[PDB]
Amino acid sequence: TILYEQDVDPKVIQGLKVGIIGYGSQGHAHALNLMDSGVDVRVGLREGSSSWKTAEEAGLKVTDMDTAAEEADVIMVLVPDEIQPKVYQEHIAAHLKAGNTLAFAHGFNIHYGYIVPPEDVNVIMCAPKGPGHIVRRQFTEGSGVPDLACVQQDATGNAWDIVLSYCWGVGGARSGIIKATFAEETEEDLFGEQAVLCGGLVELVKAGFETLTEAGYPPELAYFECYHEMKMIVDLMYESGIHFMNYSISNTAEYGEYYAGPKVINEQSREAMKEILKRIQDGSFAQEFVDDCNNGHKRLLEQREAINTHPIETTGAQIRSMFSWI
Amino acid sequence: TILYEQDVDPKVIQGLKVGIIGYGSQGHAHALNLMDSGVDVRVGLREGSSSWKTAEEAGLKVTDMDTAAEEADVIMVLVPDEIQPKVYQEHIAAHLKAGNTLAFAHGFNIHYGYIVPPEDVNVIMCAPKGPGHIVRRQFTEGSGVPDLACVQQDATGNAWDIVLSYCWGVGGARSGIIKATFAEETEEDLFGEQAVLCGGLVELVKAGFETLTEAGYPPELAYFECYHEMKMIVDLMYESGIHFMNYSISNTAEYGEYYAGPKVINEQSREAMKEILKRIQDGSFAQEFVDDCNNGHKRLLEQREAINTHPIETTGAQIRSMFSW
Numbered sequence: 001t002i003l004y005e006q007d008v009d010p011k012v013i014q015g016l017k018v019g020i021i022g023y024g025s026q027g028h029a030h031a032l033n034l035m036d037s038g039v040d041v042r043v044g045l046r047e048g049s050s051s052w053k054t055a056e057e058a059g060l061k062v063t064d065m066d067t068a069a070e071e072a073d074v075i076m077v078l079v080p081d082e083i084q085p086k087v088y089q090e091h092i093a094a095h096l097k098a099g100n101t102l103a104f105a106h107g108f109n110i111h112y113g114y115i116v117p118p119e120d121v122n123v124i125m126c127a128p129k130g131p132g133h134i135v136r137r138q139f140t141e142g143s144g145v146p147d148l149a150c151v152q153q154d155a156t157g158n159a160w161d162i163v164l165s166y167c168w169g170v171g172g173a174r175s176g177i178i179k180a181t182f183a184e185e186t187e188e189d190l191f192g193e194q195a196v197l198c199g200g201l202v203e204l205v206k207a208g209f210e211t212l213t214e215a216g217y218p219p220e221l222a223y224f225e226c227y228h229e230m231k232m233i234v235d236l237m238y239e240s241g242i243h244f245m246n247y248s249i250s251n252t253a254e255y256g257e258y259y260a261g262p263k264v265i266n267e268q269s270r271e272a273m274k275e276i277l278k279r280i281q282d283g284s285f286a287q288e289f290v291d292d293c294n295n296g297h298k299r300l301l302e303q304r305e306a307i308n309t310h311p312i313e314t315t316g317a318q319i320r321s322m323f324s325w326i
Numbered sequence: 327t328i329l330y331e332q333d334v335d336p337k338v339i340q341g342l343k344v345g346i347i348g349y350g351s352q353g354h355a356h357a358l359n360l361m362d363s364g365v366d367v368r369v370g371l372r373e374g375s376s377s378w379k380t381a382e383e384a385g386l387k388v389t390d391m392d393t394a395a396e397e398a399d400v401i402m403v404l405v406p407d408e409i410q411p412k413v414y415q416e417h418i419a420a421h422l423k424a425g426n427t428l429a430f431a432h433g434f435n436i437h438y439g440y441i442v443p444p445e446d447v448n449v450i451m452c453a454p455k456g457p458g459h460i461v462r463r464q465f466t467e468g469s470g471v472p473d474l475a476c477v478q479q480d481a482t483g484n485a486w487d488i489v490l491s492y493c494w495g496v497g498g499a500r501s502g503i504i505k506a507t508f509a510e511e512t513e514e515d516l517f518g519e520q521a522v523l524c525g526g527l528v529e530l531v532k533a534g535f536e537t538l539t540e541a542g543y544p545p546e547l548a549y550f551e552c553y554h555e556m557k558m559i560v561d562l563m564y565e566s567g568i569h570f571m572n573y574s575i576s577n578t579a580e581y582g583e584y585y586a587g588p589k590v591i592n593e594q595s596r597e598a599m600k601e602i603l604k605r606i607q608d609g610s611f612a613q614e615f616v617d618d619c620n621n622g623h624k625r626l627l628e629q630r631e632a633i634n635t636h637p638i639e640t641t642g643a644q645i646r647s648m649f650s651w
């Protein structure tokens with residue numbers, strides 16, 4: 001089920017030229033981890049982008065997107081999902097040669113049919129299960145974010161060797177690579193970020209913080225209890241399991257966990273998770289999201305403004321600004 | 327509202343002998359952080375404890391609980407909350423002298439009245455807002471878990487100086503010390519662990535993992551998606567705010583966050599939080615917990631067995647054992 005360093009061949013990606021289109025969250029992580037893994041990488045950007053100089057200063061070769069796509073054997077598309085079909089049609093498609101590989105870090109555009117690649121190129125994905133800044137940070141610390149590896153089209157007959165070697169180059173074989181399909185990855189990744197990692201988690205910490213401040217407790221106190229301490233609890237779970245986190249916390253807390261958890265994450269919460277999954281699988285969430293992107297990110301940005309001005313953020317920025325380290 | 331190093335005086339706790347009763351999750355953290363901060367510390371344990379040799383090997387003075395309470399000026403009680411009244415009456419109370427300080431790391435027993443200390447001793451609390459192993463790890467890395475500082479009784483007239491200095495000694499001034507009362511700490515601490523940090527968080531990750539495995543996804547994939555990635559998201563929030571974590575994740579994920587969050591943490595979840603807080607404030611949760619403790623921890627241990635043998639735990643133990651670093 002899970003593959004590690006003995007299951008992959010680093011030489012396969014080391015023998016191919018990689019073009020990373022974009023330099024955002026995933027783009028910088030993939031480009032720098034592959035550079036450090038001995039791969040010939042170049043980053044493709046719009047002329048005059050502010051990210052040009054950043055990438056150059058980090059030691060990477062930077063060129064325009066058309067040049068990166070024409071030079072590369074593996075073209076990895078790391079611009080926002082809603083932008084990829086336009087960037088693909090205008091700067092990538094005409095430069096694909098039979099025997100190149102087009103790669104993604106999410107299956108959204110190929111699964112939902114917004115990009116249809118030509119027949120004589122591989123279509124692969126290396127999807128790190130982790131946000132880009134951390135895909136970079138863990139690799140520099142000797143660890144690595146786990147990846148899902150997928151092949152939609154194998155024109156060379158070695159697409160699997162190529163995608164597994166690319167996961168190696170971004171740190172995935174340190175923690176584990178799982179083979180999956182483009183539809184599986186798209187659906188589980190959408191579900192996780194909606195239900196648990198970003199949707200669920202940020203609303204649970206906001207609701208706790210608002211319960212405490214509504215009840216009269218000071219917002220600095222509520223930040224250190226519901227928000228800052230979260231990292232500490234999750235660090236123990238990440239390293240050593242729920243059983244070790246529950247051994248570290250007091251018996252008072254552990255009884256409280258078992259009593260309160262099903263009350264806060266209730267039958268309705270579970271039914272909402274089933275409905276989240278249903279709208280992912282039926283394509284309705286993907287259409288909602290692309291509709292909002294074609295309406296100037298209207299919903300996204302009014303929701304961004306609301307959370308960025310929430311009292312948990314104003315209180316947290318002041319607290320964090322006063323931390324001192326020895 | 328928040329106090330830092332310039333607001334505390336390290337020399338006060340450096341001038342007092344501290345006795346730590348117990349050596350569990352908070353106990354080892356307070357003993358070793360105070361040792362490293364230049365305080366004269368001893369740990370008090372039962373003769374023959376398996377923790378005795380671990381504390382000696384870490385370089386602490388270790389004695390029996392009655393000797394540590396007789397040697398000390400500040401006696402910090404870091405045994406489980408349900409057993410503090412018995413250890414206090416049998417090994418601590420008779421050794422308190424006028425001018426000593428009795429300290430706790432949670433206000434549960436003094437708030438709910440299970441311990442009533444004598445009149446000429448200070449009664450203080452330094453409550454780190456973090457699990458003990460991390461109170462120690464952050465201090466050794468040059469950071470520190472923030473603390474609540476409280477004074478229930480000030481016999482010496484300098485109990486505030488002592489508790490703030492003690493918070494300095496365990497790393498609290500690096501991140502912030504807030505003054506609070508014993509009632510406020512007890513209520514907010516019980517609420518946070520039940521509603522958010524331990525109850526809410528573990529059931530959220532369980533429910534996402536079970537949704538995916540019921541829907542046919544493999545458990546190892548559901549572990550990496552719902553459980554392992556959580557640390558990574560929370561790290562960004564801890565270091566740089568929700569606005570930075572939302573800048574790091576894709577626009578697809580950020581739209582997904584804002585659409586799905588209120589559906590999973592719903593109006594019922596919010597009403598359950600307000601009920602959790604009401605049973606904390608009215609003492610009913612405290613009595614429920616102490617009744618379970620007086621029944622052999624029967625409910626706690628059946629629920630511990632059920633989560634320790636959940637597929638999320640069996641899958642995680644096997645995944646984590648194969649990490650290369």
Ligand SMILES: NC(=O)c1ccc[n+]([C@@H]2O[C@H](COP(=O)([O-])OP(=O)(O)OC[C@H]3O[C@@H](n4cnc5c(N)ncnc54)[C@H](OP(=O)(O)O)[C@@H]3O)[C@@H](O)[C@H]2O)c1
Pocket residue numbers: 022023024025026027045046049050051052077078079080081083087104105106127128129130131132133574575576577578
């Ligand atoms: N964020 C994550 O951690 C994460 C996790 C796993 C997978 N994914 C997947 O990785 C992929 C990329 O996501 P991301 O979040 O890394 O992207 P991102 O950070 O939002 O992408 C920013 C990059 O796209 C370029 N860009 C933006 N709009 C553009 C346009 N109209 N034309 C040309 N370039 C444009 C930007 O250019 P400038 O530099 O010039 O401003 C920047 O280099 C997506 O498929 C995503 O689902 C993301």
Ligand SMILES: NC(=O)c1ccc[n+]([C@@H]2O[C@H](COP(=O)([O-])OP(=O)(O)OC[C@H]3O[C@@H](n4cnc5c(N)ncnc54)[C@H](OP(=O)(O)O)[C@@H]3O)[C@@H](O)[C@H]2O)c1
Pocket residue numbers: 248249250251252348349350351352353371372375376377378403404405406407409413430431432453454455456457458459
């Ligand atoms: N856990 C946390 O992170 C946390 C966070 C903040 C505050 N608090 C508060 O800190 C206090 C201590 O909690 P904790 O979780 O650190 O305790 P703990 O780890 O459960 O305490 C274990 C220590 O208590 C001793 N002990 C156990 N039963 C005993 C008995 N019958 N008689 C004598 N000693 C006994 C143990 O002895 P042996 O070593 O001999 O087995 C061990 O040294 C509580 O007030 C708690 O609310 C805890």
Ligand SMILES: [Mg+2]
Pocket residue numbers: 128129130189193
């Ligand atoms: Mg993801």
Ligand SMILES: [Mg+2]
Pocket residue numbers: 106189190193576578579
């Ligand atoms: Mg995603």
Ligand SMILES: [Mg+2]
Pocket residue numbers: 454455456515519
């Ligand atoms: Mg606490």
Ligand SMILES: [Mg+2]
Pocket residue numbers: 250252253432515516519
């Ligand atoms: Mg507690």
